[PDB]
Ligand binder design. Structure first.
Ligand SMILES: Nc1ccc2c(c1)c(-c1ccccc1)[n+](CCCCCCc1cnnn1CCNc1c3c(nc4ccccc14)CCCC3)c1cc(N)ccc21
Ligand SMILES: Nc1ccc2c(c1)c(-c1ccccc1)[n+](CCCCCCc1cnnn1CCNc1c3c(nc4ccccc14)CCCC3)c1cc(N)ccc21
Ligand SMILES: *[C@@H]1O[C@H](CO)[C@@H](O)[C@H](O)[C@H]1NC(C)=O
Ligand SMILES: O=S([O-])[O-]
Ligand SMILES: O=S([O-])[O-]
Lengths: 538, 538
């Protein structure tokens, strides 16, 4: 420091940081990007829990996003924006444990509500540095302090040989918890209130938020939670200890590490990062969609039991949760290897192709369970209609994997004392490059919650700008108070809590809030009450 | 003596009576013997043709009702007693009734043949709601109805035996049909244009004449109202008939070299009728509803295979069929043994009471299967609501027993070249004495089709008189041409044929025809395609 902007120099437990003054449309914000919160989990630390970052000397430059955690880079549609906007935007490296902070400029005098973001990507991909997770707009417009962290994904984050000490599993979640601890100790330097931290995240991020709710050591690290299109309960977010062992062992075998656990993990540790990525997909038990190879494991430690069990028996009185879904959770998953589906045509499939899709979509399902699915989704007035079948296949994937789990989550939490608010997101970005048939796909509310439309250079409609402001007010009003509603406002339709009695939730679209009752009530009875029993008995 | 009232049929001369209809006189020939009384050693045997008689046979009154159980659920109550025997009970009961216009029709008239229901254990052609004069007078039709043996006498079978081959009640019907072919021309009727029509068990009987080759040259068109030959109640197997027969024999003291078929039937024949009727309801294998002890048997004779198999493989190309259901097929059955239901209160039920009702409603169901019915029929927005649960219990019984068997029948006949018209009857008689919650119960379209609202002394509303005139036209139009539509009248809308593609059918109520699509399609897919896979797999 001599000629430096005094609002950009800030000390934290690890040492001095230099941030950057960023332009948001309404004014400047402060970003501190690439703050390390753990010892780089490289070398002999691969697969291991993270250690807190050792203090540095001098002023650490925090003006740019740091490395993205090793993963599989999507090459489904090369050059296509629809897939590439999710692809890593920094170098890949095992040295990736860094977090980012956006605060108002100047930093606010009194403590500000803190929002912590946890990216999705199936526990195999993602980065806090993507354009759509840009904390600058929430920071500038809502006066909020926003934090996002990188956490280890794929094998690096979730390969477990359970009961082992050198590869215990859930270390991706432990990175996330370590970043939360960082926020407790340090966020006050940035003008954040560590007594008011809301976690929010989408897809696997949502699943992660829910896992912090269900893991006791995480509970004292945040006060409120938002789960966007993901849950800890459900078919894809966790695996049994047994299944994780099988997957770990198979992967080892594939990369030239034949199986004693010490020997095996030692040998995995000598493998180049790329070789692990190059093989992670080969360990899934069936051809399937919306399943990921290395995900949180039920270890009897981070997760003391299956999320299904923990949500059925938990006391959640102290807890406030906002949850919800987009209109077409399944559609995007179809183009990742369901025969018949593509972004470049209308994806009008046949009945054969539907039955085939369903086996892949519900891989754990017997023949009889698969017929049940098909019979339930068939339109019996037009059982051959290619359009309806295309949409059914999307709804099967969406409902089984997201909507109905969210429904179950909302039900159990609300019965057991939580204040729950629920939504369905129904607006298709005017700028989406995915075809019309895909509707509102998995992930596409995020850019609205973050306020991207306010950036005039992004070509959102004026209507979309206003809509984004609303959503930003809902989310942050929820962070601030535990209620997405506005204290001053006065019809303005109110957003009612979700209860078991009334099952109210709101539609989020360009029109003002409409209250609806029953989140796919009948169809979710199928997945949550019936289907299990078609595996319980046969 | 009135020349109009004197007819010479094959077995001798008859004297009918001139009856009074609101719009003019009709000739009626009531109580014509069509078979040797099936008594003594003829009990359980095929009927024999009636021997010729001398002089002029008095045919001016209804003859005896076939021997049957008399309802005492609600003694003195019109709603039940209107179905009870209105003439003396006797095993001597094989008589038929003919109504014609007065004067005798000048040129050959379409002939309608009625077959009552009563679950194959009750019924009589003499009931007021089967009064054939209105159709005779107004539409210029020749309307015939026969008595046939019911309960043990009509359907007790020891398959493979000469003495009790089963299905004799159907043979009774067949003989009545043969009688119409040989004799109806003398009445002005046209034997080359005979339309069978019937309701409930009567409809199933009609169905069985469609499905049995010898019956096929005795009529040209068919109308099945609220009943089908396929389904869970209309037939039993040779093994199951034997079982019930053998159990009945045992219950009435039979038996104390032959043997053990001839022996057993011999002893049964020695028993007073009331002894057989005393013990008929004790042969059923479970607590159930809409199951009857003695029903047509799959014998490989009358029925060459199961109706379900027969309808699957039949060629139905020169066949016209009118089928339908009432709005509330199941409601009436609930007051007959289903705990929680009664005509004297609104019958609001608990969920537990709903589950218990399902086990009785679907006697063959396994735990899982019954659970599926329950979970399918629940309203997940108000799953505890007593009105819905009561209505759902009603719907389960109607759908399982009538509506979905109809849908299936309609579908197969149309698929296989038959020409099918379908309806749902939704108007509740203003004169009705069953409570409102029962809606339009099983049986209560009949009074309208027969034109009773034309009798001003019966206190039907003007609207109902007009409604009855329309239905009388639909039915007799259908009898005349195989098409219920008014062939010379324009403006409609038209009753289109039922087809497997478009699944079109109409509602009959006070409003003009409305064309709907899919006869309870999703729900019948549950009943016709899924549940069967849940019986014979787990
Ligand atoms: N050429 C093929 C053929 C078959 C399969 C392929 C590739 C891939 C694939 C592998 C590496 C990189 C990308 C895809 N996967 C792996 C999993 C694919 C999951 C796709 C969606 C998703 C879910 N969470 N993360 N992602 C990856 C893409 N990131 C997105 C994300 C989100 N939304 C969207 C919406 C549209 C497109 C992408 C996208 C929101 C949350 C975060 C990431 C499959 C998985 C299977 N179980 C079966 C087939 C295939
Ligand atoms: N006290 C108990 C307790 C348990 C059971 C009882 C009686 C009876 C019963 C038998 C003879 C007479 C009266 C009742 N049934 C026999 C099944 C009878 C079904 C009654 C409804 C019906 C339907 N179609 N015919 N009927 C019989 C009477 N005639 C009717 C007719 C019609 N509609 C109706 C509508 C309401 C009342 C009666 C009725 C239409 C067609 C022809 C006859 C049961 C059958 C079971 N599977 C289980 C329990 C019970
Ligand atoms: C869409 O394209 C894919 C491959 O490009 C193909 O498999 C599919 O059949 C196509 N659908 C239609 C309706 O042409
Ligand atoms: O590129 S957008 O369509 O995700
Ligand atoms: O049976 S009575 O209500 O017409």
């Amino acid at each position: 420091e001599g000629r430096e902007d005094p609002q950009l120099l800030v000390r934290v437990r690890g040492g001095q940081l230099r941030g950057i003054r960023l332009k948001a449309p309404g004014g400047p914000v402060s970003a501190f990007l690439g703050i390390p919160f753990a010892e780089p989990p490289v070398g002999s630390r691969r697969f291991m829990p993270p250690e807190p970052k050792r203090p540095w000397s001098g002023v650490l430059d925090a003006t740019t996003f740091q490395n993205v955690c090793y993963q599989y880079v999507d090459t489904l549609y090369p050059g296509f924006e629809g897939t590439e906007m999710w692809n890593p935007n920094r170098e890949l490296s095992e040295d990736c444990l860094y977090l980012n902070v956006w605060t108002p400029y100047p930093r606010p005098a009194s403590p500000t509500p803190v929002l912590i973001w946890i990216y999705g990507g199936g526990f195999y991909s993602g980065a806090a540095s993507l354009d759509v997770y840009d904390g600058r707009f929430l920071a500038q417009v809502e006066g909020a302090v926003l934090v996002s962290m990188n956490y280890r994904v794929g094998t690096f984050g979730f390969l477990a040989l359970p009961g082992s000490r050198e590869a215990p599993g859930n270390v991706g979640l432990l990175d996330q918890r370590l970043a939360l601890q960082w926020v407790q100790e340090n966020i006050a330097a940035f003008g954040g209130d560590p007594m008011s931290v809301t976690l929010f995240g989408e897809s696997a991020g949502a699943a992660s938020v829910g896992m912090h709710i269900l893991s006791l050591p995480s509970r004292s690290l945040f006060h409120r939670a938002v789960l966007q299109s993901g849950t800890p309960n459900g078919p894809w977010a966790t695996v049994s200890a047994g299944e994780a062992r099988r997957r770990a062992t198979l992967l080892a075998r594939l990369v030239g590490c034949p199986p004693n656990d010490t020997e095996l993990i030692a040998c995995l540790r000598t493998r180049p990062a790329q070789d692990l990525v190059d093989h992670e997909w080969h360990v899934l038990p069936q051809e399937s969609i919306f399943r990921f190879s290395f995900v949180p494991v039920v270890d009897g430690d981070f997760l003391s039991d299956t999320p299904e069990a923990l949500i059925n028996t938990g006391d959640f009185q102290d807890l406030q949760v906002l949850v919800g879904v987009v209109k077409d959770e399944g559609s995007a998953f179809l183009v990742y290897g369901v025969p018949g589906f593509s972004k470049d045509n209308e994806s009008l499939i046949s009945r054969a192709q539907f039955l085939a899709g369903v086996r892949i979509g519900v891989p754990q399902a017997s023949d009889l369970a698969a017929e049940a699915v098909v019979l339930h989704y068939t339109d019996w007035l037009h059982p051959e209609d290619p359009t309806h079948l295309r949409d059914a296949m999307s709804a099967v994937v969406g409902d089984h994997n997201v909507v109905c789990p969210v429904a179950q989550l909302a039900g159990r939490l609300a019965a057991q004392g939580a204040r729950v608010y629920a939504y369905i997101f129904e607006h298709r970005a005017s700028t989406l490059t995915w075809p019309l048939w895909m509707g509102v796909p998995h992930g596409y509310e995020i850019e609205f919650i973050f306020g991207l439309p306010l950036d005039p250079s992004l070509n959102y409609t004026t209507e979309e700008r206003i809509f984004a402001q609303r959503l930003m007010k809902y989310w942050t009003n929820f962070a601030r108070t535990g209620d997405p509603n506005d204290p001053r406002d006065s019809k303005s339709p109110q957003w009612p809590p979700y209860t078991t009695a009334a099952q109210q939730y709101v539609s989020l679209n360009l029109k003002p809030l409409e209250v609806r009752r029953g989140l796919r009530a009948q169809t979710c009875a199928f997945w949550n009450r019936f289907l299990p029993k078609l595996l319980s008995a046969t």
